[PDB]
């Protein structure tokens, strides 16, 4: 927010996972979506590597 009303000057999170936990960020998207180059219907699967 804007103000703090007292001498805290810090903010508290809601999640404190350590640095052993990272969220990888996809990039080079270019608008071309995930179900575009590969055909997936309502009940199909796709494998990860």
């Amino acid at each position: 927010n804007v103000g703090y009303q007292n001498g805290f000057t810090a903010n508290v999170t809601t999640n404190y996972s350590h640095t052993t936990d990272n969220s990888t960020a996809v990039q080079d998207s270019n608008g071309e979506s995930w179900n575009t180059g590969l055909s997936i219907n309502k009940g199909e699967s796709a494998y990860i590597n």
Binding site: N15, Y16, S17, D21
Partner: protein, 49 residues
Amino acid sequence: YPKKGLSPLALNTMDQFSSRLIPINYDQLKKLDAGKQIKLETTQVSGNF
């Protein structure tokens, strides 16, 4: 063992080291259709100090 803020484990996933999954017949399923819940029990653990 998965700490607070992390994902739970899986049990008997389909892999190299696995087992046959656990079957429910019809009558136990109809009892589960009532308000009768499943109790987990631990026999003994084997550890070190």
